[model samples]
Target: MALTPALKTTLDKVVTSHKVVLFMKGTKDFPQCGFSQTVVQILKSLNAPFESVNILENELLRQGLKEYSSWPTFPQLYIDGEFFGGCDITVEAYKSGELQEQVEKAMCS
Candidate 1:
């Protein structure tokens, strides 16, 4: 099923609600999946301030996000209201120092 206009609007609001946001399988403190845990560690390592939305807590948001971000996985990172990537890309970016730069830039803006 496609997103209704209302759902789309809600998603837009959520993704843009913070400078950095992670839609994950669990909360930052206790991630339910290894992928989510990796992301939490990455953000914390960067000292980046971010909000973590637990997808397991909301089925609608979880389903909507796969289509909304064109990514079929949890731990979706958004920087400056933009879809960054899942665990692999985020890790790669982190290794290359790109993720840190992006987070800093987003926070400063």
Candidate 2:
């Protein structure tokens, strides 16, 4: 289903509220999925400050973000308020040092 106007506005607030945000299956300390855990590790390994929004907490977010991101997955990572992609893409970027670069750029701002 598509996002209702209310959901869209809420999502926009979430996306724009932080420089680094992860819409994951669980909270940072208690990740519910391996992919979510990996994303958290990536962010931590860079030592970048970020906020995690647990999709598991909100039914609307759990469903709406997939449509919002057009990614069809959990553990979606957003950097600088932009959709950076999912676990595989995030891992690839991490390996290539691109993710760190982006996070570092965010840290400076």
Candidate 3:
């Protein structure tokens, strides 16, 4: 299915409703993929509170997210309503302390 206006609106609310939102393959505690689990672990390590969306549970949402974020993968990270990156970028940012700082800013700001 295509990324409809309704779905787009829903996505907008979801991403912006929280300080941090992760569109991954499964729930935070029960990730369906390794990449998703990695991001979840990273977020937990930072003690960041985030909302997780399981794209695997909805085909339309799964397909629409790729178009909405211009990212063709699971475990898309969004901070302060902005698209951060997937597992690789998240990992790099975490190592460089960028992700930690960014998340801390979002939580406090």
Candidate 4:
């Protein structure tokens, strides 16, 4: 499914309006892919509050988001509504403590 401009606009709101947002293949309780599950685990470990949108629920959103972020992957993370990166970037950042920094900054808001 191709993303329409209207869907993109609404998606932008869902992603950016949250302090911490994760756009993954499935919801937190039922992550559809390994990458998505990995990211969900990381967030759980951080004990940070986050908002998530399951791209799989809307095929257009899934495809459009990839275009929007210029990222060729699912399980994209956004901090303060900015594109953070995919699973690898997220895991590295989490291990290196940068992810925590971002989360803390977001938590304050």
The model with the greatest lDDT is 3
The candidate, 2 or 4, that scores higher on lDDT is 2
Where in model 1 is the C-alpha error above 4 Å? 1-7
Report the candidate with higher TM-score, 3 versus 4: 3
Cα lDDT tens digits for candidate 2, 2-79: 468686776668657767788886765766658877888779877866678888776888888887777877778877
lDDT of 3 by residue, 4-102 (tens): 767777777876677788897777566665887788789988997778888878788777777777877777987776677899999999999999998
TM-score of each: 0.79, 0.77, 0.82, 0.77
lDDT of 4 by residue, 8-109 (tens): 777667656656777886665666657777787787789865667888777677677787778787779877656788999988999999988887876775
lDDT of 1 by residue, 4-102 (tens): 677677667865776777887766576665877788788888896667878877678878878777877767988776788899998999999998888
Candidate 2 lDDT: 0.77
Clashes of each: 0, 0, 0, 0
> In model 2, which range of ten residues has the least summed lDDT?
1-10
The window of 10 residues in a row where model 4 has the poorest summed lDDT is: 1-10
Candidate 2 ranges beyond 4 A from true positions = 1-5
Best by TM-score: 3
Q: Give model 2 RMSD, 1 decimal.
A: 2.6
